[PDB]
């Protein structure tokens, strides 16, 4: 009857009490889900993070959207530049000799102008170059050199991007690229769950092992660029880019970190692969490959090759998905599915009321 007084028990409980110690019961957050984003560089880790914001967080604001303009220009510049350098590297002829002096004037401008800026004289040079048949012949051969996968996407809409008062569309943002070595993080809610997602870069460089001691990691999301199978190695390294991604994934399953962690394979860039597979045989990456060179069988073949690297017999623990990170609708499906696997396999006791 008396709340501040008390009326229960019999000389068992005395002195001051600690139910405000049982406040750590409220600190019990099993609705917290930590995911590591691992994978080679340029495999789509950042893009996934961006998507998480677009889909579950509030999408990018107009102030944020405008902060990409400067990276989106650099991205475009860097891209045309890469093509132009490959004109000489692959020794490809300009469609119209006159376009050769534009390309010379570009090297000049690029080295002078302010990083992130796209002056009208530059974009005109770039717009012509793009329409040139030489550049286009060189563009189709992007596989023989280092080219942003977003190069085309941007150079196709270059005009739309230099019209004053330009606003980056969600896709544009999604297509941008900013190399980092450290860790990008993002926190968002979904399904009454707080998600903390960690994008871990510098895997081919440092390959830090402290990542293991990270506590509370529900699942590992490992990205692979499907469209990397095509890239020829001038490195002479034992394994091209596809087999390099495999060597990185091999040490993710090979590593016997015992905290309960599901691993999820994102075979990313399925859209670009769908274009490549018809032209470039999957035998380029796997010579033993007897199957046909089509999206279904080749994609599957690659998936297998990755799943087959599974060192520890992970009892119902290797999940995989063909993904297109820049495609929101797609990511919304894959992440729905991932969540559904998380909540079941790593389940807190069910509420049931």
Q: Which residues bind ligand GDP (CB under 6 A)?
A: 41-47, 148-150, 174-175, 177, 179, 268-269, 271-272, 324-326
Residue with tokens 């950042």: 46
Q: Is 178 annotated as a binding residue?
A: yes
Q: Is 149 annotated as a binding residue?
A: yes
Closer to ligand GDP by Cβ: residue 184 or 318:
184
Active-site residue, from 51, 76, 186, 203: 203
Closest approach of ligand GDP to the CB of residue 324, in Å: 4
H/E segment holding residue 322? strand 318-322
Q: Is 45 annotated as a binding residue?
A: yes
Residues linked to residue 321 through DSSP beta bridges, in sequence order = 266
Burial 308-337 (b: 16+ CB within 10 A, else e): ebbeeeeeebbbbbbbbbbbbebbeebbee
Q: Is 44 annotated as a binding residue?
A: yes
Active-site residue, from 102, 132, 172, 199: 199
Cα Rg, the chain, nearest whole Å = 25
Q: Is 248 annotated as a binding residue?
A: no
The answer for residues whose C-beta is within 8 angstroms of residue 190's C-beta and 6 or more apart is 56, 335, 339
Instruction: Give the Cα-Cα-Cα angle 69, 71, 72 (nearest 5 degrees).
Output: 60
SS3 170: helix
Closer to ligand GDP by Cβ: residue 148 or 186:
148
- Is 218 an annotated catalytic residue? no
Closest approach of ligand GDP to the CB of residue 271, in Å: 5
Closest approach of ligand GDP to the CB of residue 72, in Å: 10
- Is 203 an annotated catalytic residue? yes
Edge to edge, the sheet with strand 32-39 lists 183-189, 194-200, 32-39, 217-225, 262-268, 318-322
- Is 47 an annotated catalytic residue? yes
Closest C-alpha among 323, 342, 341, 343 to residue 51: 323
Active-site residue, from 177, 196, 297, 327: 177
Active-site residue, from 47, 186, 218, 326: 47
Closest approach of ligand GDP to the CB of residue 4, in Å: 58
Give catalytic residues, as residue numbers.
Answer: 42, 47, 177, 199, 203
Binding residues: 39-46, 149, 174-180, 202, 268-271, 325
Binding residues for GTP: 39-46, 149, 174-180, 202, 268-271, 325
Binding residues for Mg(2+): 46, 180
């Amino acid at each position: 009857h008396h709340h501040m007084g008390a009326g229960a028990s019999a000389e068992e409980k005395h002195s001051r009490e600690l139910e405000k110690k049982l406040k750590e019961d409220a600190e019990k957050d099993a609705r917290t889900v930590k995911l590591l984003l691992l994978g080679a560089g340029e495999s789509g880790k950042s893009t996934i993070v961006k998507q998480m914001k677009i889909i579950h967080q509030d999408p990018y604001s107009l102030e944020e959207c405008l902060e990409f303009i400067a990276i989106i220009y650099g991205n475009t510049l860097q891209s045309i530049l890469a093509i132009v350098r490959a004109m000489t590297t692959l020794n490809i002829q300009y469609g119209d000799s006159a376009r050769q002096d534009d390309a010379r004037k570009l090297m000049h401008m690029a080295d002078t102008i302010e990083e992130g800026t796209m002056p009208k004289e530059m974009s005109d040079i770039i717009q012509r170059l793009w329409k040139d048949s030489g550049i286009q012949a060189c563009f189709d051969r992007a596989s023989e050199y280092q080219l942003n996968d977003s190069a085309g996407y941007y150079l196709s809409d270059l005009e739309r991007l230099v019209t004053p008062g330009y606003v980056p569309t969600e896709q544009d943002v999604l297509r941008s690229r900013v190399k980092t070595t450290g860790i990008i993080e993002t926190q968002f809610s979904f399904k009454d769950l707080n998600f903390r997602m960690f994008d871990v870069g510098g895997q081919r460089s440092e390959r830090k092992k402290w990542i293991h001691c990270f506590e509370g990691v529900t699942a590992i999301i490992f990205c692979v660029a499907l469209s990397d199978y095509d890239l020829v190695l001038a490195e002479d390294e034992e394994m091209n880019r596809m087999h390099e991604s495999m060597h990185l994934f091999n040490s993710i399953c090979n590593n016997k970190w015992f905290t309960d962690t599901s691993i999820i394979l994102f075979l990313n860039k399925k859209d670009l692969f769908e274009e490549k597979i018809k032209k470039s045989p999957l035998t380029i990456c796997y010579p033993e490959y007897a199957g046909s060179n089509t999206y279904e069988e080749a994609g599957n073949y690659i998936k297998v090759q990755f799943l087959e690297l599974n060192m520890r017999r992970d009892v119902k623990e290797i999940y995989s998905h063909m993904t297109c990170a820049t495609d929101t609708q797609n990511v919304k499906f894959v992440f729905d599915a991932v969540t559904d696997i998380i909540i079941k396999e790593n389940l807190k006791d069910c509420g049931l009321f």
